[PDB]
């Protein structure tokens, strides 16, 4: 649950989802990057239900480096009521990804682990992924 | 040792803020004086294209002298370039212009004015 602390406004607009990526199209903190190939809203809960799990495969082995942080906090109403008497209280945090962006970064550990670990991790996210080998 | 201030800087800097309403049109050309360390100046100016319309000088040396506030300061306070020019607007960046550069503002208040 990667969330912030101090926010000026608590109710915001749904982010725009069209077009290619902007920044973070490469990998730094480790040899190996997991790219993204479609568009969606990753929603902090995926991240910590696809981080603890990747480390439970990693058995507290090597180290990871996350390349996605949810900023715009999405809101939602509780029980199904009438339409329109205000906005629902914030209940989530979302991050938007576009095709061509490295989401995770790791170092040192063997490529067998890299493949058989990011395949474990992608099985939680609603975006379709593809391996990247730091292919200079 | 610490930063000492130049003063030509703020002298022309103030000439700026003072040069936002007054400007010689030659129908009323302002005369505008570069005080110096020992001497004083003046010049009539027209302000349509920045050419130099009229001119005299204190330092011109029909006579030199000392005492920056001298009757030489009031002969520069009289001199003209004879034309159809009337009681000008005294450009002043120097405090108490009604008395400080009144050396210039005094003698010419009758003939140029």
């Amino acid at each position: 649950m990667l969330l912030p602390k101090r926010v000026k406004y608590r109710r915001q607009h749904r982010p725009k989802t069209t077009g290619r990526s902007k920044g973070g199209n490469y990998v730094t903190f480790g040899e190996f990057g997991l790219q993204a190939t479609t568009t969606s809203w990753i929603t902090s809960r995926q991240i910590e239900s696809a981080r603890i799990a990747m480390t439970r495969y990693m058995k507290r082995g090597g180290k990871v480096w996350i390349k996605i942080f949810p900023h715009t906090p999405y809101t939602k109403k509780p029980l199904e009521v009438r339409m329109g008497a205000g906005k629902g209280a914030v209940e989530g945090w979302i991050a938007v990804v576009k095709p061509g962006r490295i989401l995770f970064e790791v170092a040192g550990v063997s490529e067998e682990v890299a493949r058989e670990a990011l395949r474990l991790a992608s099985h939680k996210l609603p975006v379709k992924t593809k391996f990247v080998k730091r292919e200079e | 040792m610490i930063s000492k201030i130049d003063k030509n800087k703020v002298r022309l800097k103030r000439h700026a803020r003072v040069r936002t309403n007054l400007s010689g049109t030659a129908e009323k050309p302002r005369l505008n004086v570069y005080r110096s360390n020992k001497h004083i100046y003046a010049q009539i100016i027209d302000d349509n294209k920045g050419v130099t319309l009229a001119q005299a000088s204190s330092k011109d040396s029909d006579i030199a002298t000392t005492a920056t506030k001298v009757e030489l300061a009031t002969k520069v306070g009289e001199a003209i370039a004879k034309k159809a020019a009337d009681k000008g607007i005294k450009e002043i960046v120097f405090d108490r212009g009604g008395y400080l550069y009144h050396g210039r503002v005094k003698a010419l208040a009758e003939a140029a004015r």
Binding site: V81, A85, G86 | -
Partner: protein, 82 residues
């Protein structure tokens, strides 16, 4: 069906119709309005004047000219030409 928790919002004010009111290069009358805005976005230039901290108006007839002043500040002007 159930009395809702209402809205702590709903207030705004009437728009004022700011902006330019005469186009660059067209002929005017003495005394006409050229621009209406809060603060001096465009300074008054030649033969124009500022009213009560707004309404840059014309002072003589002629054609208007929009122009730059220093590096980043503009200005308006009127020329007597007929």
């Amino acid at each position: 069906k159930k009395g809702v928790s209402s809205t702590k919002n709903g207030r705004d004010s009437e728009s004022k119709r700011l902006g330019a009111k005469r186009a660059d290069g067209q002929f005017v009358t003495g005394g006409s309005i050229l621009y209406r805005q809060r603060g001096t976005k465009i300074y008054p230039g030649e033969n124009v004047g500022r009213g009560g901290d707004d309404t840059l108006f014309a002072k003589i007839d002629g054609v208007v000219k929009f122009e730059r002043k220093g590096r980043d500040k503009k200005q308006v002007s009127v020329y007597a030409v007929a």
